Write a protein that binds this DNA or RNA. Structure first.
Ligand SMILES: [Hg+2]
Ligand SMILES: [Hg+2]
Ligand SMILES: [Hg+2]
Length: 649
DNA sequence: GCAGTGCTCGTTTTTT
DNA sequence: CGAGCACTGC
């Protein structure tokens, strides 16, 4: 019903939800409710323009997002609403490559490569090419190769004109691929490019999709890279009508491939594409939006817009100058204690910082105050070492040619397959262009390895073959439990020293549970299905989930969240903005955008703080306040301070 | 391979 | 300043 979908929505949201089928850019301000627009828009396309759920493809970047969206779509709607592709670039890209793996030149069960895996593979290849890992860093190689793919550039496209400095990397890249392709491996970047290329080379397939997906919605468009923009464009073609939602002002992932352009490029490569601006904010108080507005104007790129609210101005924005970094912490904690002692929840308080560096000091301060908290730093579940070791065994069960999985657990736990043995193996793979496993088979046959070692290498191969069979007809969480024991991993981590050893076992226990609860769906078998899941869904950092805890994280990982109380620390020049943005650049505007984001995360109160002194790795330093703090209105601001009042008793 | 030891130098930053 | 970490001698 037309009113069912438009009544709760505001004037300009309706504009977006009810516009005619076409290409349009919905420029979503900060607390404007863009998701609500995306959800309502989709239900509108189905109910009003009467489109088939199979004609809709909403794409996001994070899984959290994909889920929130898949969830909300359901409740506004009747039921499941299947037939509708909702997911992330990588996720949807992965989906296509499975459905058309053969036409994509990929094997049945190709496996995905997470950062680590990829990083290690480069290291092995750089060495096996006799290159100085000291002056040819894998980390560097990685950046080169990922950056290359985010442009659709394969090795035979690199135009290294004369500097071997580049002609060399191309070499690495060429080997990396040759290897990956030989083992059935695909990294994140590959997923998009292979998909893209897939449409380029197979007209009928591309045709089949242009025919199905006529309604495309893309969120966070300001964070797309060149190949994603391209992938969308190619799919929309001439028929598809795409709605892109974005904020050219919250783009803060440029240092990894995000194109500030794309949001405008859309407008250019799309005449007729109108632009609906959502500027009513239902998040913050008027002062916050004021300061927010003010700040962001200082940047020049911008497509323009002013966040406004119907709510009261609210409390002013508190600024604080602390002695040193350790005082700044106590300040934040005491404001929070007050919050709490007045009935405030801890989980409604967030302390934001620019660098992970800044968390240490904050925690002790919180801990000392016996104040519960949660940090959102790193180490996802499917990235912990005990988990990857386990997965690499399952990985070997699916495909013996998974060099990455082989290299990882062949001698993990130690089973006597040393370096002199593995050195021979890794070289044979190069010279006879074979996958590690293949090479171990010919060498064994040829008896080219030292008897005792060879005997060990053998026993290994037999173990994997034995598990690949014995475990064929078992439930996923049974096969997992068996592999975790037979691999010898449990025994290894069982006897690992103290607290850490404990933690690693409790996680292997969690891996089985995750497998148990793993809900099927479909296209592939559970083990592969599950491996794909673990590679694409990092999966958080465990329990301690019920406690009312204060929220700590970097500004980057606060994007999209909102808290009544938001504390931003380290607001000083030399830290925010810092190095790069100082000695000449322009990443500065990105830094002010990051700032802008932080500011627009506050609902009731914002407290910015900085110190006159902090011990920046090494000596004491004396930073002055971020220019950002000075770019906020004087009326919306309120400076707090402690003064030495010596009263003669 | 692994336990210790001597030496970096600080990536702003996190997704998949 | 120290977490992380390339180096050997067993
Ligand atoms: Hg339609
Ligand atoms: Hg001060
Ligand atoms: Hg104000």
């Amino acid at each position: 019903d037309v009113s069912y979908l438009l009544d709760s929505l505001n004037d300009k949201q309706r504009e977006a939800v009810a516009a005619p089928r076409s290409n349009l850019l919905v420029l979503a301000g900060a607390g404007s409710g863009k998701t609500r627009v995306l959800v309502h828009r989709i239900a509108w396309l189905m109910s009003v323009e009467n489109c088939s759920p199979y004609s809709i493809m909403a794409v996001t970047f994070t899984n959290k997002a994909a889920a929130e969206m898949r969830h909300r779509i359901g409740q506004l709607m009747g039921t499941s609403q299947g037939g509708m592709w909702v997911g992330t670039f990588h996720g949807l890209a992965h989906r296509l490559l499975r459905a058309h793996h053969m036409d994509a030149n990929l094997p049945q069960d190709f496996q995905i490569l997470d950062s680590e895996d990829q990083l290690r593979l480069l290291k092995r290849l750089i060495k096996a090419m006799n290159l100085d890992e000291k002056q040819w860093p894998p980390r560097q190689a990685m950046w080169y190769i990922n950056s290359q793919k985010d442009e659709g550039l394969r090795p035979h496209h690199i135009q290294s004109y004369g500097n071997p400095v580049e002609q060399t990397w191309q070499k690495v890249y060429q080997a990396y691929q040759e290897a990956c392709d030989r083992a059935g491996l695909v990294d994140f970047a590959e997923l998009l490019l292979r998909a893209h290329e897939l449409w380029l080379n197979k007209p009928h397939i591309l045709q089949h999709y242009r025919e199905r997906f006529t309604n495309i919605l893309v969120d966070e468009f300001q964070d797309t890279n060149n190949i994603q923009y391209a992938w969308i464009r190619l799919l929309a073609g001439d028929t598809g009508k795409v709605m892109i939602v974005g904020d050219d002002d919250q783009s803060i992932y440029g240092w990894r491939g995000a194109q500030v352009e794309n949001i405008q490029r859309f407008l250019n490569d799309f005449p007729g594409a109108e632009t609906i601006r959502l500027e009513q904010n239902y998040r913050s108080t008027s002062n916050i939006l004021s300061a927010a507005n003010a700040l962001i104007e200082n940047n020049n790129g911008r497509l323009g817009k002013k966040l406004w609210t119907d709510g009261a101005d609210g409390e002013p924005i508190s600024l604080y100058c602390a002695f040193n970094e350790l005082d700044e912490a106590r300040f934040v904690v005491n404001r929070i204690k007050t919050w709490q002692d007045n009935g405030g929840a801890l989980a409604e308080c967030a302390i934001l910082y620019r660098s992970n560096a800044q968390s240490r000091v904050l925690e002790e301060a919180l801990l000392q105050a016996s104040m519960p908290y949660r940090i959102y730093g790193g180490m996802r579940f499917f990235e912990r070492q005990e988990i990857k070791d386990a997965l690499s065994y399952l990985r070997l069960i699916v495909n013996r040619n998974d060099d990455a999985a082989f290299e990882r657990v062949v001698n993990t736990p130690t089973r006597g397959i040393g370096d002199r043995t593995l050195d021979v193996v890794r070289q044979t793979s190069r010279d006879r262009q074979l996958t590690l496993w293949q090479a171990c088979r010919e060498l064994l046959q040829e008896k080219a390895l030292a008897g005792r070692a060879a005997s060990a290498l053998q026993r290994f191969m037999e173990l994997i073959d034995a598990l690949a069979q014995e475990t064929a007809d078992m439930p996923l969480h049974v096969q997992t439990d068996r592999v975790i024991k037979d691999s010898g991993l449990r025994t290894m981590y069982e006897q690992e020293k103290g607290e850490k050893g404990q933690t690693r076992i409790e996680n292997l226990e969690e891996l089985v549970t995750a497998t148990r609860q793993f809900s099927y769906n479909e296209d592939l078998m559970p083990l592969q299905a599950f491996l794909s899941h673990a590679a694409l869904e990092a999966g958080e950092g465990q329990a301690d989930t019920w406690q009312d805890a204060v929220q700590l994280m970097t500004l980057h990982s606060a994007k999209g969240l909102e808290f009544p109380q938001v504390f931003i620390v380290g607001m000083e020049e030399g830290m925010f903005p810092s190095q790069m943005s100082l000695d000449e650049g322009g990443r500065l505007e990105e830094e002010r955008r990051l700032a802008y984001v932080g500011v627009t995360r506050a609902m009731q109160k914002l407290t910015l703080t900085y110190a006159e002194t902090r011990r920046l790795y090494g000596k004491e330093v004396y930073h002055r306040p971020s220019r950002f703090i000075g770019e906020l209105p004087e009326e919306c601001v309120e400076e707090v301070r402690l003064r030495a009042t010596v009263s003669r008793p």
